[PDB]
Design an enzyme around this catalytic site. Structure first.
Site, PDB file in Angstrom:
ATOM      1  N   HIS A  58      -0.618   0.051 -11.047  1.00  0.00           N
ATOM      2  CA  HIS A  58      -1.523  -0.896 -10.417  1.00  0.00           C
ATOM      3  C   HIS A  58      -2.359  -0.126  -9.395  1.00  0.00           C
ATOM      4  O   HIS A  58      -1.945   0.053  -8.245  1.00  0.00           O
ATOM      5  CB  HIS A  58      -0.741  -2.035  -9.757  1.00  0.00           C
ATOM      6  CG  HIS A  58       0.166  -2.768 -10.695  1.00  0.00           C
ATOM      7  ND1 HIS A  58      -0.296  -3.528 -11.749  1.00  0.00           N
ATOM      8  CD2 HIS A  58       1.515  -2.845 -10.742  1.00  0.00           C
ATOM      9  CE1 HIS A  58       0.729  -4.045 -12.402  1.00  0.00           C
ATOM     10  NE2 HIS A  58       1.841  -3.648 -11.809  1.00  0.00           N
ATOM     11  N   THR A  59      -3.524   0.351  -9.835  1.00  0.00           N
ATOM     12  CA  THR A  59      -4.478   1.055  -8.962  1.00  0.00           C
ATOM     13  C   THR A  59      -4.884   0.220  -7.743  1.00  0.00           C
ATOM     14  O   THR A  59      -5.184   0.776  -6.681  1.00  0.00           O
ATOM     15  CB  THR A  59      -5.739   1.502  -9.739  1.00  0.00           C
ATOM     16  OG1 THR A  59      -6.269   0.400 -10.485  1.00  0.00           O
ATOM     17  CG2 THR A  59      -5.407   2.628 -10.704  1.00  0.00           C
ATOM     18  N   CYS A  60      -4.886  -1.104  -7.914  1.00  0.00           N
ATOM     19  CA  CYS A  60      -5.019  -2.071  -6.820  1.00  0.00           C
ATOM     20  C   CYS A  60      -4.081  -1.772  -5.652  1.00  0.00           C
ATOM     21  O   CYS A  60      -4.525  -1.619  -4.510  1.00  0.00           O
ATOM     22  CB  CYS A  60      -4.726  -3.483  -7.341  1.00  0.00           C
ATOM     23  SG  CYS A  60      -5.816  -4.034  -8.678  1.00  0.00           S
ATOM     24  N   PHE A  61      -2.788  -1.676  -5.962  1.00  0.00           N
ATOM     25  CA  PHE A  61      -1.735  -1.503  -4.954  1.00  0.00           C
ATOM     26  C   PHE A  61      -1.249  -0.055  -4.767  1.00  0.00           C
ATOM     27  O   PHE A  61      -0.348   0.178  -3.955  1.00  0.00           O
ATOM     28  CB  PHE A  61      -0.540  -2.401  -5.304  1.00  0.00           C
ATOM     29  CG  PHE A  61      -0.879  -3.866  -5.372  1.00  0.00           C
ATOM     30  CD1 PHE A  61      -0.976  -4.627  -4.207  1.00  0.00           C
ATOM     31  CD2 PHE A  61      -1.102  -4.490  -6.598  1.00  0.00           C
ATOM     32  CE1 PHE A  61      -1.286  -5.979  -4.264  1.00  0.00           C
ATOM     33  CE2 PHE A  61      -1.411  -5.842  -6.663  1.00  0.00           C
ATOM     34  CZ  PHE A  61      -1.505  -6.588  -5.494  1.00  0.00           C
ATOM     35  N   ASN A  62      -1.846   0.909  -5.485  1.00  0.00           N
ATOM     36  CA  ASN A  62      -1.378   2.310  -5.496  1.00  0.00           C
ATOM     37  C   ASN A  62       0.127   2.374  -5.829  1.00  0.00           C
ATOM     38  O   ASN A  62       0.907   3.047  -5.146  1.00  0.00           O
ATOM     39  CB  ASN A  62      -1.701   3.016  -4.154  1.00  0.00           C
ATOM     40  CG  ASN A  62      -3.062   3.702  -4.141  1.00  0.00           C
ATOM     41  OD1 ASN A  62      -3.219   4.740  -3.495  1.00  0.00           O
ATOM     42  ND2 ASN A  62      -4.052   3.130  -4.828  1.00  0.00           N
TER      43      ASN A  62
END
Lengths: 373, 85
Positions: free
Chosen positions: A343-347
């Site tokens: 999840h690149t959103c949340f690293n």
């Protein structure tokens, strides 16, 4: 934060070439990368040729991964271009690892300027091909690229004790010190005075003219004696990057646009990683995870970073500097039959609790290859 | 490197030379030497080709034909090494 929207727009504005061959060929020897890279690249009268997919082959090595071999080249050439041994660049001082254009580069090498243009082209290349140069340069460099003024402030980060010497003069009476409008410089054992203005040797520095003294010392420290070199550099760079496109970035961003490390330090990565839902630094699966990251190459590490964060930008300094602000996290999700997902959103990496090291290595590698599609 | 040091121990039998990098090697020679062969001495100690060097004493770029005595160098004469381009 807005860098993501900026970098997107930047790349979207970077026009592809439609009149140029499919690959830029480079046939180099590792022993002589500088010579070999310099000849080839400074041979090309049209800059546009350098925008083709970089096809680089060392010492006869055939059929290696094209984007991985580029990675190596940019590193090795950066290592050579910027080596103060040559006198194009030099360390800002002793006990300093940052770099600056050497004012006396022309004394060192009479063809310094075409080498400066070359470095500019190689730097613009890096940008154009979303790759980075391996270089710690002083902020002044990046200011000068945006044609932005240099200040007393700028000397602090470069040389604190010398900055303090000028700060002292700003706030105190210089009559005590019987100074002149000269700076002495040592080069090749000999010492030389340099007059800051016409007849500066005869001019005493006083309260009435010290603000002028300080100003002039700054220009001499940073601007006046590197115009020709920096110009050359900028010429090469802008042969590949339009100057209008570079204008949207500031001096801080512009170091992130073109500079950075060609491998992610693993200790630093491990230092700034959080764990959720059972996992922990000394958990068996986490032990195996880092074993993997350790036993990757830089190319596999950067592909993993992209998989999880959504970028390949290694800043220098810290993984602490990784923006709300969110650091790297590894959570337990799923079963061993599930591949891991990001999840690149949340690293954040969602990693199932695998049976072995090799399972984790394979399942993870596949998941990354699934995003290469 | 290790080899340069070990070889010296068995020799039947001091000057400094600095670079713009920070480090500077120290060579042992007799002033009969020319410029050309001293470049080799650097080839040996640090692995830099003789072509890839410029040697400068007293801020003056040094000539191949002349010897160390012909360029008035003495014991502990600080020299300067910068890469050719």
């Amino acid at each position: 934060r807005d860098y993501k929207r900026k970098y997107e727009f930047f790349r979207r504005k970077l026009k592809k070439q439609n009149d140029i061959p499919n690959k830029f060929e480079m046939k180099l020897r590792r022993a002589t990368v500088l010579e070999d890279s310099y000849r080839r690249i400074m041979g090309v009268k049209r800059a546009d040729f350098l925008k083709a997919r970089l096809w680089i082959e060392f010492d006869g090595e055939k059929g290696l991964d094209y984007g991985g071999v580029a990675r190596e080249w940019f590193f090795l050439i950066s290592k050579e271009m910027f080596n103060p041994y040559y006198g194009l660049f030099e360390y800002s001082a002793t006990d300093n690892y940052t770099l600056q254009i050497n004012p006396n580069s022309g004394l060192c090498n009479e063809d310094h300027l075409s080498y400066f243009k070359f470095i500019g082209r190689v730097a613009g290349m890096a940008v154009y091909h979303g790759k980075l140069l391996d270089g710690f340069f002083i902020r002044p460099f990046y200011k000068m690229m945006l044609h932005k003024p240099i200040t007393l402030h700028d000397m602090e980060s470069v040389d604190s004790e010398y900055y303090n010497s000028l700060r002292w003069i700003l706030e105190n009476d210089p009559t005590e010190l019987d100074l002149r409008f000269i700076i002495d410089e040592e080069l090749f054992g000999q010492t030389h005075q340099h007059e800051l203005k016409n007849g500066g040797s005869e001019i005493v520095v006083t309260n009435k003219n010290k603000k002028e003294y300080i100003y002039l010392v700054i220009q001499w420290r940073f601007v006046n004696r590197i115009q020709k070199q920096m110009a050359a550099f900028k010429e090469g760079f802008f042969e590949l990057i339009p100057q209008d496109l570079i204008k949207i970035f500031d001096e801080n961003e512009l170091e992130l646009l073109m500079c950075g490390l060609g491998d992610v330090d693993v200790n630093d990565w491990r230092e700034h990683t959080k764990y959720k839902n059972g996992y922990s630094a000394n958990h068996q699966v986490i032990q195996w995870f880092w074993k993997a990251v350790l036993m990757m190459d830089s190319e596999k590490r950067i592909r993993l970073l992209q998989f999880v964060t959504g970028t390949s930008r290694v800043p220098m300094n810290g993984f602490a500097e990784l923006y709300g602000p969110q650091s790297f996290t590894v959570e337990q999700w799923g079963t061993p039959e599930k591949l891991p997902r990001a999840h690149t959103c949340f690293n954040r990496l969602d990693l199932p609790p695998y049976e072995s090291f090799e399972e984790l290595w394979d399942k993870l590698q596949m998941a990354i290859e699934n995003t290469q599609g | 490197h290790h080899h340069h040091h070990v070889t010296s121990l068995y020799k039947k039998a001091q000057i400094f030379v600095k670079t713009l990098a920070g480090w500077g090697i120290t060579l042992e020679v007799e002033p009969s030497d020319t410029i050309e062969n001293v470049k080799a001495k650097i080839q040996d100690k640090e692995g830099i080709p003789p072509d890839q060097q410029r040697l400068i004493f007293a801020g003056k770029q040094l000539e191949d034909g002349r010897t160390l005595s012909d360029y008035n160098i003495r014991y502990d004469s600080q020299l300067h090494l910068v890469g050719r381009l």
